[PDB]
Design a protein around this ligand. Structure first.
Ligand SMILES: OC[C@H]1O[C@@H]2O[C@H]3[C@H](O)[C@@H](O)[C@@H](O[C@H]4[C@H](O)[C@@H](O)[C@@H](O[C@H]5[C@H](O)[C@@H](O)[C@@H](O[C@H]6[C@H](O)[C@@H](O)[C@@H](O[C@H]7[C@H](O)[C@@H](O)[C@@H](O[C@H]8[C@H](O)[C@@H](O)[C@@H](O[C@H]9[C@H](O)[C@@H](O)[C@@H](O[C@H]1[C@H](O)[C@H]2O)O[C@@H]9CO)O[C@@H]8CO)O[C@@H]7CO)O[C@@H]6CO)O[C@@H]5CO)O[C@@H]4CO)O[C@@H]3CO
Ligand SMILES: OC[C@H]1O[C@@H]2O[C@H]3[C@H](O)[C@@H](O)[C@@H](O[C@H]4[C@H](O)[C@@H](O)[C@@H](O[C@H]5[C@H](O)[C@@H](O)[C@@H](O[C@H]6[C@H](O)[C@@H](O)[C@@H](O[C@H]7[C@H](O)[C@@H](O)[C@@H](O[C@H]8[C@H](O)[C@@H](O)[C@@H](O[C@H]9[C@H](O)[C@@H](O)[C@@H](O[C@H]1[C@H](O)[C@H]2O)O[C@@H]9CO)O[C@@H]8CO)O[C@@H]7CO)O[C@@H]6CO)O[C@@H]5CO)O[C@@H]4CO)O[C@@H]3CO
Ligand SMILES: [Ca+2]
Ligand SMILES: [Ca+2]
Ligand SMILES: [Ca+2]
Ligand SMILES: [Ca+2]
Ligand SMILES: [Ca+2]
Length: 1055
């Protein structure tokens, strides 16, 4: 088309520098983009700089602090703009500048000119842009070149772009093999499509509501999208004469979904065994070439196959023989990546990989149904615990565990199984026997921290050193140790563990030496929580005895079978679909973003940079093919690994619709699978309806409740310093046993009691209780940091807990918070009292591995990379890992002062306390499952049967009294043995007497009577008249015994 105006650069040269700063000088160019378009010779008399020294930048020589002084006018100027020569006292550091016309800012931003980064101290700026450029050419190309990525090709015919609104020429340029750039004639001569303004359709605004305010443009219905998506596309806008306004890169995930997803969703992906052979398929709708590279066991290329592109789906496939089973493979990609703007060439593992080589370098063809990859009996393995009804689900009592935390320290686990899946098969080890005991007593589910393929442990054992090994080994594999203050131990002949123990003696807030060595250990040990996804649907390799090939698959299943069959527990996996470990075209662990660049990651709407609000490389579960990958991945964990439930990490970054979609998909495989996650606020509500506590009401999708958690623990996860001690919780005596720093008022204490009672009734929005002032409140009317406290529809949608892998352990919180006068035995009872609010509540019960052993991390708040030393759990019951060194200073350094003040208040728990806490713990879990009344499942049923005494403004502070009705006003007798239950948690130093049940023949539960002196209710007195005397820091479960008819019980009061 020749009538089309040709888009071109300004008909002016790219500018050199006006002047170059001399000694004790800096030079600022203002590149006058408007006057480069020229017309009228520009007048710069009113341009001026405001120059001042503060504390961070002070190099200016004679800065005039008078804001109203506009006399710092240009030193000179040429056709490209003015420049300023600025005297200096020094050529290092920086200067502060605001660029003005008169007193108005041309750049609404205090500028810092760093001599350290601009060594010739000669920089350029442009009006309306806070960026400091090294040269006018750079700034010039910034203004008249490609920049950012704010154009959004969202379906076949709709481009959303700011830069093109009310511009005469708006075009989508595209180049198959090079980056769209101006000619030798300054002309953009690459091929393009023409764009005409239009109106955002309803389907596009529904799909992309965060973009609905973007100026919309239409493409011809006959544009060949497949051709444009093969290379670079750049949206370009231009004036009426053809001069370039702006040019930006294009985000294409919307049009990729509109063009390909319907066809692509019908296909299955990865290396798939069939009856004819093996079918390979990978989704790569923008790739120019995909070659399947086949590797021998020793990683030699033994074949290379150009794959067949299916043009409806953008998937690539190839079919080979059945003998390819066990073979290693990668996809050789030829694909444009917008981040580098190059057509990249690299081999990538399969995102649908189901088996891996060591350290995930190669994917491997596997048939997960092979009986060689199954323990004997696998196919008939069943759930030891039902999950079918809401009452089934409410019984869930979760023990959140980590593969190394379980066995790394257990000398009774065979050495070669320590830190391995197979440690769970060590039937006589302390660890497994302790777990069996916990299961007999009513822990029902093991929840496993990441056992999918994580990135952050090196699976080549030669490159790893663990604290149980010689310190010389640590030196060999970690070259930083050589130049560390611990270098001398390289010759010591002792283990790293022996050195860390030795370092305990002089370790202090002033000499944090244990943490110092451990930070080096952490770089090259086997330890990480593993919230760092490499491949979503392969087991982690470092947890296998053999990480090379399929061995880990059978070992994983042997563990799963042992937990269900040897230990009697169901299994929940933590899954982390909300982010990838890395993105872009070069990083070793960028898998998804090498194959389909900019599709699987969530990007900033204007820069196209991968967002990091999760921590890392944010994913895009709102995109259709990643939603499919998630669902397909869960299908394998469900069917092929027999996982009973999934906990979604940062579920709030997922659309509600996508989570429910995945759930219906998985429920069609197994109807009893349970989904829950972290449903905080992801700040993504502008893009879709997030999968949050609030939005998931009624769905049956569970969420961690932070309500009872914070009320019982005290404070919040972002407390530091004195606040860690001041913010006592119900479990540590808020308002009844104050420590020396706190100012908690009685009203504040009663408010925590409201959140705790609300949580023990399942944290429902509609539950009705009497609040701290004696007023009638619905759950949703109790405040929690401004949000409605109660949010659920059924208690199965709420997971209560007072300790978790992240943030401080319960014991460390009690240690921060307990008054000096609380002795060691009282603190053990505070731990049990805290856990009682979870274990005796209607919400699903969740707890950190080792709360029953008073688990400590030496005050470490965030132990994800703190190794075996700080995450130690001692199943030989010698101690609780308390006081083993100051925690990592980079995250807890601002807590050293309060740590040192509170740390040594009482002795460190030893074997007597550990056994006592475990008995306490098993007493609580046995109580939880002793009656269906504790686990009613259905919220309306909770509302009809659960009530509280000792409420209102004159309540006895810290005394929690819950009643569960099994009498006629409620409905049927769900429990044949009792007409009602009373739960009384006396979180207080005073003994207390209940008269609410005078005359009722109330009696103590048989479980607690049988524990005798060892019971949380030791010393409870039930008088003849039915009054109950509760010791300090006690938990009592009482019951109305049943006679041969459902009695009156404990009718809920209508309020
Ligand atoms: O001395 C205490 C503060 O110390 C530190 O501040 C120093 C800076 O670090 C240092 O760089 C330098 O400041 C320079 C600054 O960085 C440059 O940007 C520039 O400032 C000029 C600015 O760019 C112009 O726009 C203009 O300012 C006008 C402004 O735009 C206009 O809106 C109005 O300002 C009024 C505010 O709108 C109004 O809210 C109110 O201000 C409140 C304020 O909001 C409130 O927070 C409180 O101020 C606190 C402050 O928050 C504290 O942090 C602390 O200040 C210290 C800083 O933190 C350090 O950074 O204490 C303050 C309490 O005294 O109370 C204010 C009420 O008084 O009123 C505003 C004024 O009426 O008016 C101006 C009109 O000119 O001109 C600016 C310069 O004139 O140049 C700065 C160099 O002067 O120096 C700082 C030390 O002086
Ligand atoms: O994103 C990086 C962080 O990731 C990890 O954080 C995870 C948490 O550990 C985990 O518990 C969960 O958090 C959710 C939480 O469980 C839910 O309850 C809820 O959180 C809400 C909370 O309950 C409410 O109280 C309220 O918070 C208010 C708060 O009460 C109030 O005091 C104030 O907050 C101020 C702080 O008190 C004050 O100290 C300071 O905070 C600074 C901080 O000092 C500084 O170091 C820096 O923070 C860093 C941090 O040090 C880094 O380690 C890293 O944080 C990560 C965590 O460590 C991970 O464990 O990066 C941070 C910076 O990005 O900067 C802080 C300030 O920005 O000032 C605070 C105010 O500015 O106000 C708030 C009210 O706004 O609302 C809470 C909502 O967030 O939901 C949580 C979901 O985030 O999951 C986390 C997963 O990421
Ligand atoms: Ca320069
Ligand atoms: Ca791994
Ligand atoms: Ca580590
Ligand atoms: Ca956002
Ligand atoms: Ca009954």
């Amino acid at each position: 088309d020749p009538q089309d105006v040709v888009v071109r650069l300004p008909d002016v040269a790219v500018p050199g520098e006006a002047v170059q700063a001399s000694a004790r000088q800096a030079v600022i160019h203002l590149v006058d983009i408007a006057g480069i378009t020229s017309s009228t010779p520009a007048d710069y008399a009113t341009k001026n700089l405001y120059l001042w020294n503060n504390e961070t930048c002070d190099a200016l020589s004679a800065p005039v602090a008078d804001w109203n002084d506009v006399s710092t006018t240009p030193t000179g100027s040429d056709k490209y703009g003015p420049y300023w020569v600025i005297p200096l006292t020094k050529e290092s550091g920086c200067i502060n500048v605001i660029v003005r016309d008169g007193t108005n800012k041309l750049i609404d931003s205090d500028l810092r000119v760093s001599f350290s980064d601009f060594t010739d101290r000669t920089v350029s700026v442009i009006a309306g842009n806070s960026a400091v450029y090294d040269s006018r050419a750079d700034a010039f190309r910034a203004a008249f070149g490609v920049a950012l990525a704010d154009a959004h090709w969202v379906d076949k015919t709709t481009l959303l772009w700011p830069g093109g609104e009310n511009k005469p020429i708006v075009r989508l340029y595209y180049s198959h093999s090079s980056k769209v750039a101006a000619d030798s004639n300054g002309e953009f001569s690459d091929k393009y499509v023409k764009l005409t303004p239009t109106t955002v359709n309803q389907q596009v605004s529904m799909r992309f509501p965060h973009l609905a305010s973007y100026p919309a443009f239409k493409l011809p219905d006959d544009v060949n999208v497949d051709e444009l998506l093969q290379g670079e596309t750049v949206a370009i806008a231009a004036e009426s004469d053809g001069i370039l306004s702006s040019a930006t890169q294009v985000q294409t995930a919307g049009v990729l979904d509109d063009t390909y997803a319907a066809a692509a969703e019908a296909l299955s992906y990865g290396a798939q065994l069939t009856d004819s052979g093996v079918t390979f398929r990978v989704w790569a709708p923008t790739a120019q070439q995909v070659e399947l590279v086949i590797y021998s066991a020793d990683k030699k290329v033994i074949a290379s196959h150009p794959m067949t592109r299916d043009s409806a789906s953008g998937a690539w496939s190839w079919q080979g023989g059945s003998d390819l089973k066990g073979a290693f493979y990668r996809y050789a990609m030829t694909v444009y990546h917008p981040q580098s703007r190059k057509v990249e060439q690299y081999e990538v593992t399969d995102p649908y990989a189901h088996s891996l080589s060591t350290n995930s370098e190669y994917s491997q063809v596997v048939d997960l149904n092979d009986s060689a990859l199954k323990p004997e009996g696998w196919d008939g393995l069943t759930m030891p615990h039902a999950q079918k009804t809401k009452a089934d689900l409410a019984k869930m009592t979760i023990h959140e565990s980590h593969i190394r935390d379980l066995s790394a320290w257990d000398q009774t686990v065979p050495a070669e199984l320590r830190g391995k899946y197979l440690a769970l098969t060590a039937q006589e080890s302390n660890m497994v026997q302790h777990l069996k005991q916990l299961s007999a007593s009513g822990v029902t589910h093991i929840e496993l921290l990441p056992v999918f393929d994580l990135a952050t442990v090196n699976e080549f054992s030669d490159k790893v050193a663990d604290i149980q090994q010689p310190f010389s080994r640590l030196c060999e594999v970690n070259s930083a140790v050589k130049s560390s203050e611990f270098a001398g131990y390289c010759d010591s002949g002792s283990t790293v563990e022996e050195v860390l123990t030795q370092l305990k003696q002089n370790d202090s807030k002033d000499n944090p030496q244990v943490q110092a060595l451990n930070t080096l250990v952490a770089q090259t040990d086997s330890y990480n929580w593993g919230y760092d996804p490499f491949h979503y649907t392969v087991p982690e390799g470092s947890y296998a005895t053999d990480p090379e090939g399929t061995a880990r698959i059978k070992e994983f299943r042997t563990m799963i079978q042992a937990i269900k069959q040897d230990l009697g527990m169901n299994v929940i996996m933590d899954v982390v679909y909300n982010h990838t470990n890395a993105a872009g075209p070069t990083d070793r662990t960028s898998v998804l973003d090498k194959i389909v660049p900019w599709y699987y990651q969530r990007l900033n709407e204007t820069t196209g940079s991968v967002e990091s609000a999760t921590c890392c490389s944010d994913s895009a579960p709102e995109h259709r093919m990643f939603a499919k990958l998630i669902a397909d991945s869960l299908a394998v964990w469900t069917t092929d690994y027999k996982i009973d439930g999934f906990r979604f990490d940062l579920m709030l970054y997922h659309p509600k619709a996508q989570i429910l979609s995945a759930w219906e998909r998985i429920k069609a495989l197994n109807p009893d699978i349970y989904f829950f996650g972290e449903g905080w606020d992801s700040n993504q509500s502008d893009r879709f309806e997030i999968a949050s506590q609030i939005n998931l009401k009624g769905t049956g999708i569970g969420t961690f409740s932070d309500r009872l958690r914070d009320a019982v623990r005290g404070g919040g996860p972002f407390d530091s310093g004195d606040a860690l001690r001041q913010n006592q919780g119900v479990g540590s005596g808020a308002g009844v046993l104050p420590n020396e720093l706190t100012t908690l008022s009685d009203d504040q204490a009663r408010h925590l009691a409201d959140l705790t009672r609300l949580g023990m009734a399942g944290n429902l929005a509609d539950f009705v209780l009497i609040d701290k002032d004696g007023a009638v409140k619905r759950g949703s009317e109790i405040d929690y940091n401004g949000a409605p406290g109660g949010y659920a529809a059924d208690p199965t949608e709420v997971v209560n807990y007072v300790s978790k892998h992240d943030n401080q352990t319960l014991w460390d919180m009690i240690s921060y918070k307990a008054a000096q006068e609380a002795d060691l035995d009282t603190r053990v009872r505070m731990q049990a009292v805290s856990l009682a609010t979870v274990m005796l509540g209607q919400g699903i019960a969740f707890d950190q591995q080792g709360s029953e052993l008073l688990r400590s991390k030496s005050f470490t708040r965030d132990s994800y990379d703190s190794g075996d030393w700080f995450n130690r759990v001692d199943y030989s019951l010698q101690d609780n890992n308390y006081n083993v060194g100051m925690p990592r200073s980079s995250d807890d350094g601002s807590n050293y002062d309060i740590i040192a003040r509170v740390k040594d208040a009482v002795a460190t728990p030893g074997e007597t306390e550990l056994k006592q806490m475990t008995a306490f713990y098993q007493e609580l879990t046995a109580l939880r499952k002793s009656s269906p009344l504790f686990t009613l499942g259905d919220g309306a049923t909770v509302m009809k049967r659960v009530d509280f005494r000792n409420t209102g403004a004159d309540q006895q502070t810290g005394l929690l009294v819950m009643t569960i009705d099994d009498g006629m006003q409620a409905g049927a007798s769900l429990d044949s043995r009792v007409d009602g239950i009373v739960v009384a948690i006396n979180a207080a130093p005073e003994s207390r007497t209940l008269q609410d049940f005078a005359g009722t023949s109330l009696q103590l539960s048989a479980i607690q009577q049988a524990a005798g002196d060892r019971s949380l209710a030791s010393g409870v007195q039930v008088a003849a008249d039915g009054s109950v005397t509760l010791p300090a820091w006690s938990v009592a479960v009482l019951e109305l015994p049943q006679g041969e008819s459902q009695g009156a019980g404990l009718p809920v009061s209508s309020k």
